[PDB]
Write a protein that binds this DNA or RNA. Sequence first.
RNA 1: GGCCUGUGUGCAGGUGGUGCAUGGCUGUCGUCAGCUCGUGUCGUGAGAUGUUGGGUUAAGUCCCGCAACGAGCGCAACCCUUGU
Length: 228
Amino acid sequence: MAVVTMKQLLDSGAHFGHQTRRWNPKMKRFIFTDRNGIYIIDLQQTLTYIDKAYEFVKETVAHGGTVLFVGTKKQAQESIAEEATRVGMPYVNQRWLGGMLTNFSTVHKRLQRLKELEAMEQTGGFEGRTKKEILMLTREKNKLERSLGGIRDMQKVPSAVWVVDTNKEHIAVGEARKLGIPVIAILDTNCDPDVVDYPIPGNDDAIRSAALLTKVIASAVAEGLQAR
RNA sequence: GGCCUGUGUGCAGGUGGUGCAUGGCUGUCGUCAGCUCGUGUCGUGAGAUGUUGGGUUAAGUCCCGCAACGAGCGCAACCCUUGU
């Protein structure tokens, strides 16, 4: 079962991959052909694996669970932010700090610092805070927001992750597979299916495709919530 | 009770030794800006990362990046004096 299909999928350009000289030949299971020097992806496999991952995220969220959206790539980051802001789920789209989920104690302590600074802002304490103090702490708040702002309310150690461009975000994949978390991911030709559990073999270098895949995963988690 | 008196007894006393047994204090590299730690990660491991890289700074000062995130001692500032 899929909310979308080949037509409204390849309207974007998800069927594309990368050139024939940058690819993991584990992808052969998902290769369709080679055209214009790039490989083309088996969208039937993408549909059945979309169904797999949809059922996965649905049952996890219904049992009580959370997905971390990670799309630091420029091609996807704004869409990732949009869907994650809509559904109200944790996300990062600017940078992955090494240790977000495996040094989560420390990263959560710095989230507590962010909330302390936001309570400071609520108090509007500006007169006891000198000028360089105000400016350096605003810069620090902006750093903490750019990095962790998408997960202000996390305190989870979550149950799933949603990756764009494993090659770009190999740190999150390693942290997940080290801590025992499942990762759904957009598998392009340059990616590795051995690390991804419930993949989604689309394009990562295409903004429309990444937005579309984030949208269907967003809808899946929304229905997993509505099933509560 | 104090005070001495001696019998002495304990013992005081030693600027007598060892600063290669020691504290304390000090010098010194150097007021140089560096030295470290927790967690995480990499590595069989010693260890590495952080703390490297680009730029900037008097400065590990700060920024941008970055499997690192942070913290601490140091930097700077708080102090005195001089200058309106």
